[PDB]
């Protein structure tokens, strides 16, 4: 029906918790973002980067997970016959323990995660120090310098040709020293992506906005997507928040369904319209209820598991400084028209 099945009424707390955690909702914002990302993935048409900006806890990683899952059925029937090809690969940037970013570690991690399809397939990277041990784990020597690892990764990426290269938590690329420029790092990434011809999708918070519109090249070369939250200043976002609260309420595995619609205000206070934060709060309070053995949900358990005031303050400050740079107004359109002379 519109909620959890009644059979789950005779199970343990673990089954209810697992069902709720493995439950992802499709709000209209997520639907539009998923559709345009899928369309972009189908035909990037000379796009090197797809930056994914959004507030921490809006649903970037789940969207990426669903994208790779979809790519895995649009490929599997075509992967029955073809081989030596992966549908999609992913990686998360490492925050360096030193003052500067470790590009060699990025290359090694990318080579490790890319090359494990099957022991049967073999391919010579052309770099001395890279092999596969008896356990089937791709091993790289400690002396293979960064350019050699880059060449090996280039060869592997050309051979494997994934439909996209996902780089989550991309803002960690910005951990550089004084003289180092962000344009240099993004230019190295662009050179890699263009030479292997593999589309790169960078996902992260609004700090990744420091990697936006740096040069005219890095700029053209880019489809910027925005995972915006729900804002209380518009009726449609408020109504959608209420509707997602209602569907969550009907999909909370409890004998009695709590009334979360009336308590939306405080909700929006601690969640900032981000569905991921709302879901983690709801799953935490459900675990609390199933440990205490409570049939329904009350406000006290909601206040025992909500975020702190200062945390939400800093989150909203970052979110404001982010949305301030990702808004389109007719004044900017006319300014560009006048600068070009089209007006």
């Amino acid at each position: 029906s519109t909620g959890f099945p009644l059979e789950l009424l005779t199970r343990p707390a673990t089954e209810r918790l697992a069902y709720f955690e493995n439950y992802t909702v499709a709000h209209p914002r997520l639907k539009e973002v998923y559709e345009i990302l899928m369309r972009t993935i189908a035909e990037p048409a000379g796009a090197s980067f797809i930056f994914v900006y959004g507030a921490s806890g809006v649903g970037k990683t789940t969207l990426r997970l669903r994208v790779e899952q979809k790519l895995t059925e649009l490929a599997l029937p075509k992967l029955e016959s073809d081989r030596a090809r992966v549908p999609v690969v992913g990686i998360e940037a490492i925050a360096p323990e030193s003052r500067y970013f470790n590009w060699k570690e990025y290359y090694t991690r990318a080579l490790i995660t890319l090359e494990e399809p099957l022991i049967d397939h073999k391919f010579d990277y052309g770099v001395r120090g890279i092999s596969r041990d008896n356990f089937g784990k791709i091993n790289v020597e400690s002396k293979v310098v960064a350019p050699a690892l880059r060449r090996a990764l280039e060869n592997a990426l050309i051979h494997r040709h994934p439909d996209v290269f996902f780089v989550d938590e991309a803002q960690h690329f910005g951990k550089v020293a004084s003289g180092y420029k962000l344009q240099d790092q993004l230019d190295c990434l662009k050179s890699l992506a263009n030479m292997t011809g593999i589309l790169h999708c960078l996902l992260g918070t609004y700090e990744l906005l420091t990697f936006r519109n740096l040069s005219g090249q890095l700029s053209r070369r880019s489809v910027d997507i925005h995972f915006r939250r729900y804002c209380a200043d518009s009726p449609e976002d408020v109504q959608a928040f209420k509707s997602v609260l209602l569907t969550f309420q009907q999909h909370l595995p409890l004998a009695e369904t709590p009334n979360l619609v009336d308590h939306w205000e405080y909700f929006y206070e601690r969640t900032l319209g981000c569905i991921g934060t709302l879901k983690d709060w709801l799953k935490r309070v459900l675990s609390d209820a199933l440990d205490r053995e409570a049939t329904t949900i009350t406000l006290k358990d909601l206040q025992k598991r909500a975020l702190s005031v200062a945390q939400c303050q800093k989150m909203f400050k970052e979110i404001q400084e982010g949305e301030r740079q990702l808004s389109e107004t007719e004044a900017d359109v006319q300014n560009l028209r006048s600068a070009l002379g089209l007006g």
Binding site: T24, V25, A26, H27, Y34, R66, A240, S243, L246, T247
Partner: peptide, 8 residues
Amino acid sequence: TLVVYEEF
């Protein structure tokens, strides 16, 4: 009227 969404 409150809408009910589906599973992603």
